[PDB]
Amino acid sequence: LEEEFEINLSVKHLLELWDKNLLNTFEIGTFKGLSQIHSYMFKDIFDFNGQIRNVNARYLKQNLEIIDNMKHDTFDQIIDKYVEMNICHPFREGNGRSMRIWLDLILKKQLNVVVNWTNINKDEYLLAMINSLIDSTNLKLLIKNNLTNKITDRNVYIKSIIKSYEYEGFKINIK
């Protein structure tokens, strides 16, 4: 009955990332990139932390190399990389969490902005993300509108942990 620990923990792990200044370390827009965020984030919560799942499996490797080579220079390219990376869903558990950080990290490099997830309504996102298998448009507009250049605002970052955590379940308060 320690699911709330595991949540407070990963959230801790995610702050250490901001504070010790470690998240500018991470490889931008690779799988090796997401791998390291997932690794640290879940260090003390999953034995499979950072490791590609096995069970429903060998052509998964295959997809990631394909994605790895997708250019990520314009915005349209980056969200194209997000969509396909999220479509691949290469971890046993909590992919979408590691991938919204992974995303913020790419944009922050390439267009000097992050995603102000606290404007991005939970329902509208979930929805535009399902349309994203077919049609990644709805998601493009939604994220473009809610960019901010405040790429160094530990607040935006705190509040972004919260809406990211809210989309995948989990409530928690900042502290």
Q: How far is the CB of 137 from a copy of itself (least distance, A)?
A: 6
Binding site for a copy of itself (CB under 8 A): 1-2, 4-5, 8-9, 11-12, 15, 87, 121-124, 126-127, 130-131, 133-138, 141, 166, 169, 171-175
- Complex with a copy of itself: residue 28 or 147, whichever CB lies closer: 147
Backbone dihedral region for residue 25 (phi beyond 0: left; psi -120 to 50: alpha; all else: beta): alpha
d(CA 23, CA 17): 5
User: Tokens 């308060």 map to which residue?
Assistant: 173
Name every residue whose Cβ is closer than 8 Å to that of residue 95 and which is 6 or more positions away in sequence. Answer: 38, 86, 89
Q: How far is the CB of 44 from a copy of itself (least distance, A)?
A: 8
Task: Judge contact between 42 and 94, C-beta under 8 A.
Answer: yes
Q: How far is the CB of 27 from a copy of itself (least distance, A)?
A: 21
- Complex with a copy of itself: residue 109 or 173, whichever CB lies closer: 173
